[PDB]
Amino acid sequence: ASMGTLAFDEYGRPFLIIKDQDRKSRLMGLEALKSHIMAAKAVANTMRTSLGPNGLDKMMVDKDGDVTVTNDGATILSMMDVDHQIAKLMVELSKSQDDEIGDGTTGVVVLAGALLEEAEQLLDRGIHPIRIADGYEQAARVAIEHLDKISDSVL
Amino acid sequence: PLSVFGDRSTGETIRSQNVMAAASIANIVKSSLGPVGLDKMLVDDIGDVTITNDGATILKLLEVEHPAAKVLCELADLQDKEVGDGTTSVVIIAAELLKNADELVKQKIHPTSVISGYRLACKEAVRYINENLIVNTDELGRDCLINAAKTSMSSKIIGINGDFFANMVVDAVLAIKYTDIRGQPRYPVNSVNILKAHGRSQMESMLISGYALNCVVGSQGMPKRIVNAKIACLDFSLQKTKMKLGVQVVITDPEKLDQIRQRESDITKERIQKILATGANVILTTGGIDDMCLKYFVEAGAMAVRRVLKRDLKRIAKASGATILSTLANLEGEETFEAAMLGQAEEVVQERICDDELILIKNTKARTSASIILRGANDFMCDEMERSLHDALCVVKRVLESKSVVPGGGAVEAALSIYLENYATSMGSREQLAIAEFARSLLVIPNTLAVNAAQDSTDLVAKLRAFHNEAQVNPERKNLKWIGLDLSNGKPRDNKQAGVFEPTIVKVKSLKFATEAAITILRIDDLIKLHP
Amino acid sequence: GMNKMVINHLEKLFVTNDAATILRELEVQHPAAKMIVMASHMQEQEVGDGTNFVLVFAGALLELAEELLRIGLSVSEVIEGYEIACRKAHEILPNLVC
Amino acid sequence: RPVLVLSQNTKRESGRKVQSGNINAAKTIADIIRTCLGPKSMMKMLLDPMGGIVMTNDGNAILREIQVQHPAAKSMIEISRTQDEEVGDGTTSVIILAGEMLSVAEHFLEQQMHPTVVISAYRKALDDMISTLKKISIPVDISDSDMMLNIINSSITTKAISRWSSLACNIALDAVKMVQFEENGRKEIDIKKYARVEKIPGGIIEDSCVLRGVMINKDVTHPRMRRYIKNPRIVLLDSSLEYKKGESQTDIEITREEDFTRILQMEEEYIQQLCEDIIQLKPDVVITEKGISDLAQHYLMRANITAIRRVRKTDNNRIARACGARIVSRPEELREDDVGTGAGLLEIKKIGDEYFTFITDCKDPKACTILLRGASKEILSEVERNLQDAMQVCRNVLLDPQLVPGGGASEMAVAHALTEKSKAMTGVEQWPYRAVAQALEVIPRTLIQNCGASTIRLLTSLRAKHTQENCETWGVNGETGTLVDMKELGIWEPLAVKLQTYKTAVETAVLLLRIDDIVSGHKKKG
Amino acid sequence: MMPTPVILLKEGTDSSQGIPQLVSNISACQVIAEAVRTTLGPRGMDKLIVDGRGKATISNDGATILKLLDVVHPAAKTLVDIAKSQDAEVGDGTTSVTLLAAEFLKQVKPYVEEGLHPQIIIRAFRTATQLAVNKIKEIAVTVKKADKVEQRKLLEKCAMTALSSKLISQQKAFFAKMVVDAVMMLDDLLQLKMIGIKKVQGGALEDSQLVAGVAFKKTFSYAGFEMQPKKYHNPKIALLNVELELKAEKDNAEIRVHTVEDYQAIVDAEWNILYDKLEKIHHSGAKVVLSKLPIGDVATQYFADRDMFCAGRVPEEDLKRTMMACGGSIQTSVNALSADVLGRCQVFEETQIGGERYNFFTGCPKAKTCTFILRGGAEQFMEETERSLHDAIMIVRRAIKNDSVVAGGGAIEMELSKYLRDYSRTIPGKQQLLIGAYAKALEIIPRQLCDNAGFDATNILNKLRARHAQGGTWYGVDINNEDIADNFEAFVWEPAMVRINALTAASEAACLIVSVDETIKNPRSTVD
Amino acid sequence: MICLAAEYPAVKFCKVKSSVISQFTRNLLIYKGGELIGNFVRVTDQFFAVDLEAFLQEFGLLPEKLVLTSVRNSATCHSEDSDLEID
Numbered sequence A: 001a002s003m004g005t006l007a008f009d010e011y012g013r014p015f016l017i018i019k020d021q022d023r024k025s026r027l028m029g030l031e032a033l034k035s036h037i038m039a040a041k042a043v044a045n046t047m048r049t050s051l052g053p054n055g056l057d058k059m060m061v062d063k064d065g066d067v068t069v070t071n072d073g074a075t076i077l078s079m080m081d082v083d084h085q086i087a088k089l090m091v092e093l094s095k096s097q098d099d100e101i102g103d104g105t106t107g108v109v110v111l112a113g114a115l116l117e118e119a120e121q122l123l124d125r126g127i128h129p130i131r132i133a134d135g136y137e138q139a140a141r142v143a144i145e146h147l148d149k150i151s152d153s154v155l
Numbered sequence B: 001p002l003s004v005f006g007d008r009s010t011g012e013t014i015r016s017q018n019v020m021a022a023a024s025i026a027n028i029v030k031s032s033l034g035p036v037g038l039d040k041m042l043v044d045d046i047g048d049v050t051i052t053n054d055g056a057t058i059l060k061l062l063e064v065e066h067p068a069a070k071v072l073c074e075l076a077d078l079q080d081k082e083v084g085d086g087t088t089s090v091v092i093i094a095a096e097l098l099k100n101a102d103e104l105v106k107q108k109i110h111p112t113s114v115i116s117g118y119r120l121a122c123k124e125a126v127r128y129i130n131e132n133l134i135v136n137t138d139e140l141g142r143d144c145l146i147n148a149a150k151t152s153m154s155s156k157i158i159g160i161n162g163d164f165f166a167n168m169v170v171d172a173v174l175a176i177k178y179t180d181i182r183g184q185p186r187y188p189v190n191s192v193n194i195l196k197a198h199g200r201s202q203m204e205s206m207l208i209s210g211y212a213l214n215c216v217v218g219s220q221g222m223p224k225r226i227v228n229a230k231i232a233c234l235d236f237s238l239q240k241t242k243m244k245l246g247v248q249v250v251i252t253d254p255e256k257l258d259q260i261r262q263r264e265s266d267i268t269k270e271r272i273q274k275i276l277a278t279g280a281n282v283i284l285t286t287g288g289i290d291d292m293c294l295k296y297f298v299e300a301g302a303m304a305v306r307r308v309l310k311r312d313l314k315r316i317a318k319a320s321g322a323t324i325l326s327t328l329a330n331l332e333g334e335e336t337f338e339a340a341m342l343g344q345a346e347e348v349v350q351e352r353i354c355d356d357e358l359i360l361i362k363n364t365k366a367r368t369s370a371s372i373i374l375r376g377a378n379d380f381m382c383d384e385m386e387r388s389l390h391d392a393l394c395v396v397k398r399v400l401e402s403k404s405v406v407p408g409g410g411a412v413e414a415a416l417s418i419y420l421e422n423y424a425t426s427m428g429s430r431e432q433l434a435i436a437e438f439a440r441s442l443l444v445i446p447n448t449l450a451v452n453a454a455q456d457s458t459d460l461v462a463k464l465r466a467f468h469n470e471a472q473v474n475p476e477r478k479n480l481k482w483i484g485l486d487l488s489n490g491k492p493r494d495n496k497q498a499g500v501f502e503p504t505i506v507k508v509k510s511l512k513f514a515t516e517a518a519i520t521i522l523r524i525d526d527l528i529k530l531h532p
Numbered sequence C: 001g002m003n004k005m006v007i008n009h010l011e012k013l014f015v016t017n018d019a020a021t022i023l024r025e026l027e028v029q030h031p032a033a034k035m036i037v038m039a040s041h042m043q044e045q046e047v048g049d050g051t052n053f054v055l056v057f058a059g060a061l062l063e064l065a066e067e068l069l070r071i072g073l074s075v076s077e078v079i080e081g082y083e084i085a086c087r088k089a090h091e092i093l094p095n096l097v098c
Numbered sequence D: 001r002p003v004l005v006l007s008q009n010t011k012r013e014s015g016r017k018v019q020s021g022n023i024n025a026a027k028t029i030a031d032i033i034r035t036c037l038g039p040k041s042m043m044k045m046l047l048d049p050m051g052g053i054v055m056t057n058d059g060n061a062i063l064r065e066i067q068v069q070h071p072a073a074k075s076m077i078e079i080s081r082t083q084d085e086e087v088g089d090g091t092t093s094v095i096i097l098a099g100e101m102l103s104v105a106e107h108f109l110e111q112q113m114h115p116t117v118v119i120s121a122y123r124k125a126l127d128d129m130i131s132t133l134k135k136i137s138i139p140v141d142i143s144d145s146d147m148m149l150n151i152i153n154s155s156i157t158t159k160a161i162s163r164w165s166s167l168a169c170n171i172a173l174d175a176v177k178m179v180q181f182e183e184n185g186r187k188e189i190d191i192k193k194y195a196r197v198e199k200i201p202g203g204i205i206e207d208s209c210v211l212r213g214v215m216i217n218k219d220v221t222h223p224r225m226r227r228y229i230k231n232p233r234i235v236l237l238d239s240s241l242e243y244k245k246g247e248s249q250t251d252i253e254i255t256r257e258e259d260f261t262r263i264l265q266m267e268e269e270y271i272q273q274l275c276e277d278i279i280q281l282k283p284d285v286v287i288t289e290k291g292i293s294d295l296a297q298h299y300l301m302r303a304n305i306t307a308i309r310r311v312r313k314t315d316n317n318r319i320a321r322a323c324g325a326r327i328v329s330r331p332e333e334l335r336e337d338d339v340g341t342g343a344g345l346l347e348i349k350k351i352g353d354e355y356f357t358f359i360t361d362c363k364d365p366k367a368c369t370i371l372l373r374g375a376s377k378e379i380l381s382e383v384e385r386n387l388q389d390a391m392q393v394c395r396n397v398l399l400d401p402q403l404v405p406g407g408g409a410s411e412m413a414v415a416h417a418l419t420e421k422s423k424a425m426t427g428v429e430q431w432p433y434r435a436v437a438q439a440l441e442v443i444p445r446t447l448i449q450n451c452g453a454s455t456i457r458l459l460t461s462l463r464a465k466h467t468q469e470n471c472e473t474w475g476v477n478g479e480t481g482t483l484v485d486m487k488e489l490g491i492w493e494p495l496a497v498k499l500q501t502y503k504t505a506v507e508t509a510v511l512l513l514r515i516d517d518i519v520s521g522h523k524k525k526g
Numbered sequence E: 001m002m003p004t005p006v007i008l009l010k011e012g013t014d015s016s017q018g019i020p021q022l023v024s025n026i027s028a029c030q031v032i033a034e035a036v037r038t039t040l041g042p043r044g045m046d047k048l049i050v051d052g053r054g055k056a057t058i059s060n061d062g063a064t065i066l067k068l069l070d071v072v073h074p075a076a077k078t079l080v081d082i083a084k085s086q087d088a089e090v091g092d093g094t095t096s097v098t099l100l101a102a103e104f105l106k107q108v109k110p111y112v113e114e115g116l117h118p119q120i121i122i123r124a125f126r127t128a129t130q131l132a133v134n135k136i137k138e139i140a141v142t143v144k145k146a147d148k149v150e151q152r153k154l155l156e157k158c159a160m161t162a163l164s165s166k167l168i169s170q171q172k173a174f175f176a177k178m179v180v181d182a183v184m185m186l187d188d189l190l191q192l193k194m195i196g197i198k199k200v201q202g203g204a205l206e207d208s209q210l211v212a213g214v215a216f217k218k219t220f221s222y223a224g225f226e227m228q229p230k231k232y233h234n235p236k237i238a239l240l241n242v243e244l245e246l247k248a249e250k251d252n253a254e255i256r257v258h259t260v261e262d263y264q265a266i267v268d269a270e271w272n273i274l275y276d277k278l279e280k281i282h283h284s285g286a287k288v289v290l291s292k293l294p295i296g297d298v299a300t301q302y303f304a305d306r307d308m309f310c311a312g313r314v315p316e317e318d319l320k321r322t323m324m325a326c327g328g329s330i331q332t333s334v335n336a337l338s339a340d341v342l343g344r345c346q347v348f349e350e351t352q353i354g355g356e357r358y359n360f361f362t363g364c365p366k367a368k369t370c371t372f373i374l375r376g377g378a379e380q381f382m383e384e385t386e387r388s389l390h391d392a393i394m395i396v397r398r399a400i401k402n403d404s405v406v407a408g409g410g411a412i413e414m415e416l417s418k419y420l421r422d423y424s425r426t427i428p429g430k431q432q433l434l435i436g437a438y439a440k441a442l443e444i445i446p447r448q449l450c451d452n453a454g455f456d457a458t459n460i461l462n463k464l465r466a467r468h469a470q471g472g473t474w475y476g477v478d479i480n481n482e483d484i485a486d487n488f489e490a491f492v493w494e495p496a497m498v499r500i501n502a503l504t505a506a507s508e509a510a511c512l513i514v515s516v517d518e519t520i521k522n523p524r525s526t527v528d
Numbered sequence F: 001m002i003c004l005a006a007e008y009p010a011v012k013f014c015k016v017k018s019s020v021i022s023q024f025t026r027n028l029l030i031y032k033g034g035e036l037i038g039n040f041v042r043v044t045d046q047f048f049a050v051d052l053e054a055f056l057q058e059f060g061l062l063p064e065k066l067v068l069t070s071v072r073n074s075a076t077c078h079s080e081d082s083d084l085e086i087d
């Protein structure tokens, strides 16, 4: 479950496959999915407080000591210093939302965190994650069609 | 999330790790199986050297860290304790069973089904062995015991020496035979004192028609040969009498000190006079003997041996008819010694064996006892000879107690594999694969035997399986069940007429123990290793 | 013959059963083994095949020379006998052409 | 430390490498002492880690001082020790033979022959070797002193003592003959306990002799005692002649005035009573393994008795054997037959700057002391080793009256017999049989090599000679390097020594051939 | 062993030989296969690998995963090499080759342990592989009609099958159609450099578009660029390799004058050289100017004053694609800017795509190139989309070369296993065991599919074996229906050369691994 | 120590490098049951095996005071099931 796998062969001879395999960790399957969901949930729960007119600002400090008081989700996540790859994926998602639209960079992270949180308890009941992704795609198509249905045009 | 101070392995990782450990243990001793097997030379990192072929000794000496490897080592130790032979075979069979079971598990077969199939296969294999593959030794005679001893001593340092060592083992075992209540002939092995001494060759090792002591007379004064011995066994030291803790000597009249001091040794003098007045010739005691008592024995023209081992003294007393006497106290509160407690022997001699001396109690009356003096080239060779001799003695005891033997050379394994792979289709839907894998794993013994001789294992095992299939299919070809492996020529051979036999208990116990060990290891799919 | 995997000092992997290639990638240190390796490489350069033949023949010759030295023969006697036998073999070889 | 089925310090190697390493280690052990065989052998200087120097050419002495790491070398050293302890001679021969057989076995192991076939061939060859050695042996007449001396001379001619060969042979023969004992129908020699060798540096080796009695490095306890008694009556004791405490706690309680002096007077009276009990037998010399009190010395001198104290138990037993006495622990139980009569002279004389006690005129003594006087301590140690070899050979030939030709004759004869026996085997195991048969030629080859003659020509001539009918006694003259019949040269060996050497070498080869795997590094696990 | 005061090989040399060495090699190959095992099939799962510098790569392609692993085992490197070879020759099946080779080795491991000679195993592998390749070529279904609609449908189905295992499998029809169109627009060589792939952050996967022309990112405009019109309705494109700015005439050029009149003349001469180049470009009739070399601010303002578009420092590959689309020629000199060396496109436009400006050349009727614009929420998302589209493009190119298809989902390998077992039943028996082992190893792919999908592999394999025994060549694993079905009727199609190369490479790797008996490792030099 | 180890089988004579364990190095440890008994450092200030034995015995640390067997007799220790003659 960690530090890869070591066997040293059944005849006692040295058994080396990957360079520096004694200093490389590895997570597999459900445990990795749970860790990723935990990281994404943490990021989304941090972001969700800054959502809406009553949302509060995050006061970011960089590595040079400069302070940036802000409410934009994309800026907050870009100035954050993270190592988890799922947190980096959240940051990239906020950046992509900012690039394409420029608004709603906080809603995307909260929605993704909620989706992964629900997928966690779906996995706990024995559903293949690909099946969950397919169901999410179907529901997203339905939601997009509904959004097109109830939209209004302005001059 | 767990926050457990340790490492955790789960799923295929831990199962593969356990199979790895079992396979490594099996491969350690796989090269010491069968007559074409070869010994191993272990060094105890302080210069001590051990040369052996016994699986139990090798596994005990090695340092083992993995729990599954420890399980296999303890399995070998248990097999040695309960049977005495087939210590390598049980380990190899258990490891092969675990490997095949894990191969099945990796195919999404649930371990419970594999365990049920293994249990059913083991029960059916035992039943089939008992029903078909056993041979009654009543109509064979001493030749069966000789052949069993020779087969046991194959692959050992006394292999070619078997023609003589088998006779020696059979004679030694038959000498110690006794019948207890219920009229059951019991053979108390480990009552045969095995003495080692380098020097002369293997061919001229001595089998004693009596008992052999690794002790000498306490002083040069006494004679070293008594013809009509009267052995007196004692369990107390013959020394100057000293009062216990609760008794303390306080002197007020000085005239009595000399009397006290004189009595202090006159007590022991009187005890020795009482012992020797009845005609005792040889006196053996577990405790020490000081100089004055030795002088008494020297003047009496008797023998005195001190620091005799308790088990040796008990065996000598039982063989010679003597009774151990922890004290000379009778039921009248007096201090007497009677001739009825004296054991007799036809001769007691202090023989010289390679610049050292030992006491031989030859031809004890009222009971026959045996001892073996092994002569070799050095200490390591003598130790390996002793281990092989113990294995042969255990095999002969098993054959004499249970009068059923089975052909060796992997014939039983091949017959079991064929029968089990045929029977697996009779019942079950998913444990059928488990029974088939049990049958396949039972073939690891003839495979290893063929490999050790640098013979084509595939062709030999295929021919053996064809012979056993013909035996199990054609009713009139049932005589082919004894077709084993002839490793000298690398051809199948009828081992029943060739004289290759093993006790049925060896195979049955090996199968049961290996199946239980494989089941025990197979139940683990998660390991937590807390940091020390 | 069986192929051999050789990892030289640069972690370059060679999988071959060519004697000259195997010896080239090996880090031979003993001067006598070095001389035999030079002989094998010279055979490779001159002809292109027979390096393994050269190596095994040299090894067998040296073992039999060691046996001869042990039984009592001098180095000079062994050397002159080997030279005479080599000349005899070179004389014989043309007659073996098929 | 992930997984690690076995311990991290457990190293395992197996295959052809193990067999080659074992055989090479055995060959190296043989090569260490190869040059120390034969009458023209050269001595070696071994440096004791404790600071001493061992200068010898005995195989066992050389090998015992060598510390090795390869367990095959340990097995070879144990083989040397076993050969030394069993027969006491042929220690270099067994090592050389084992090395040669292991080499010729490596020859077949390089091919596709399983070691079990080689082992079976070796065992058959060993049986035939024993049979041939028994066949080509000759009896000896133990009553013939000259031929016994000749046998001892042939045994010791390869050692440094060979210069004084006649003196050494006479000393060894006399010691072995007089230490020989017979009691209760049991025959024994027991050179280990009796026939003590006492070496005193200085003087000349021509003055060495074996005494008709025992000599110890002891002096009289009091000067007034006689240092020269003509026909002493010796009494031996174990218990001390002094007032000792009892085993039990024996606290006293003195209240009256005169009890202290009374206790001291009773101590003196007890000493006097013990001395009177000793004197009652009217002895002349009293020997005790423990201390003797000064008051006891006075009471003994009052009866004109010489007393010696603090004598080792082995020395006391040797004196008892020599003078026909019995050691007595309780003086009150001393009886007449325990008094040692039979010693013909006792003399305390000064050698160098020390006092030595001589009991050297016993009639029919069963123990003796060999007084070695030489140049230095190391030379005397080597002389003692050579004389020990001589005594062992004498004991072996006394127990076994069989005799075998030496100088390489026996090895070549046995090799030829085994060759014509293997000529009609028609099997696959005939090759190892013939190889181990011809491996016996390493002994004549080593003799020729040490002599300096031409090895190949001499061995070819010897092999051609042994093909004739009555040529089993033809060997090599180790001093001139020429073929010579050993019924003229006179070199002979006891059959027991040859049998033990052959058996030990063959079994060493078998034991080392049986092994193909080595594991090491594990703790003792006591 | 013995100390040997003078050693043969230097210290640190490691040698392993015999059966244990080959068993260890097989175990290492098994580990390598397990490292990428769960990435096979529509239910496969991506792997994330972090390098030394902290960059994370997320991929489902087996070859990429194997390359990212720092494999140092000499025997294990063979699997990575054969995966790379399969990727190079075919482009798909990089996960299948490693699984097949490791399954071969695992199946023959018990025979190795019992002392069977490796050459027998090698011969059996060669014979079985030859028979399997012949059978694949025999039973592969081909259409000998050259119908445009049927060929397009076959290409689309092959692209969908090659794409229905990645993160873009939800939109596999859309991507497959665009991939087929892009491949069909290639002229005769199907050069991969003629299909540009542009990744722009932001936007849904359905926002990705295929440009029937060429599109590239805006390249460092100068002052006055914002005054140039950004849309043309029939522009003539001038493809140039010219530096249009004031600079020294030559690196070694030197001007020596001794009069201020000559000084002014030299300055005016430099300006006139630049203006002559610009005037020639303008009089060529072109409206859009693209150059690989930089275009200065003076040239930018000059072109702006003429209502003309300029873009300097355009990458060379983008200029090649523009030439192949519009149909001009790259000119190093503007001396002869004739009408035949000027590209033409129907519409040129600069538009914003997710915070970036892209130039578009659409409406080209004779274009022999394309440009994929991929949208995604992360750079690794777009990288994996590009990898998947590359796999699909390679498959479509191979199908264009030859339309020989076999049903996927393990049906082809089940048929091959049945055929090989039937063949092995009719031979002496020493080779029969090894050929049966080969046939059993051929069953790994359907078993792996069932394991990844969460099925019970044993029941599905038994049903597939029973179906193939009683007839039916194209019955594989139905992932959605938890059962088996005729994969040919389900349009799960693969090019035959995919499986042919997979079998060939796996057999070669297994034979090479088995043939090795000893491995030697010399100490690494310059330890410092 | 090597000479003394022969006469003292109950002792565990051993040596260890000083580096693995320079104020004590620029210019004999006794344990018993885990606790220190003798701590003689730089014994050269205060040799032969007899001298070392006497020095250790004068402090009452060396145990106070053996026939030689053939090679060995013991094999194991368990329920040997010794012979029990019956009827």
Ligand SMILES: Nc1ncnc2c1ncn2[C@@H]1O[C@H](COP(=O)(O)OP(=O)(O)O)[C@@H](O)[C@H]1O
Pocket: B032, B033, B034, B035, B053, B054, B055, B084, B085, B086, B087, B088, B089, B090, B151, B152, B154, B155, B156, B407, B408, B409, B410, B449, B484, B485, B486, B487, B500, B502
């Ligand atoms: N003469 C023989 N011929 C063929 N097979 C034999 C012969 N002697 C023993 N065997 C077989 O060799 C196998 C290995 O026995 P071995 O390993 O020496 O006993 P253990 O397992 O007690 O160490 C046994 O199962 C036996 O059946």
Ligand SMILES: Nc1ncnc2c1ncn2[C@@H]1O[C@H](COP(=O)(O)OP(=O)(O)O)[C@@H](O)[C@H]1O
Pocket: D036, D037, D038, D039, D041, D058, D059, D089, D090, D091, D092, D093, D094, D154, D155, D157, D158, D405, D406, D407, D408, D447, D476, D477, D478, D479, D491
């Ligand atoms: N005068 C001699 N001439 C030839 N050979 C001799 C002579 N004396 C002894 N030998 C041979 O030398 C051998 C004795 O060698 P030695 O140095 O005693 O070895 P070891 O001490 O092991 O017996 C004997 O086998 C004997 O045959």
Ligand SMILES: Nc1ncnc2c1ncn2[C@@H]1O[C@H](COP(=O)(O)OP(=O)(O)O)[C@@H](O)[C@H]1O
Pocket: E039, E040, E041, E042, E044, E062, E092, E093, E094, E095, E096, E161, E162, E163, E164, E165, E408, E409, E410, E445, E449, E476, E477, E478, E479, E492
């Ligand atoms: N719709 C499908 N139904 C069943 N099997 C499929 C389907 N699509 C692909 N497969 C199978 O999945 C296997 C793996 O394909 P893929 O993961 O795309 O590339 P690779 O062959 O490199 O693993 C193929 O052998 C194919 O037979």
Ligand SMILES: [Mg+2]
Pocket: A103, A104
């Ligand atoms: Mg907003």
Ligand SMILES: [Mg+2]
Pocket: B085, B086, B087, B152, B391
């Ligand atoms: Mg056995």
Ligand SMILES: [Mg+2]
Pocket: C049, C050, C051
């Ligand atoms: Mg060639």
Ligand SMILES: [Mg+2]
Pocket: D089, D090, D091, D155, D158
């Ligand atoms: Mg000698």
Ligand SMILES: [Mg+2]
Pocket: E092, E093, E162, E163, E165, E391
């Ligand atoms: Mg694919």
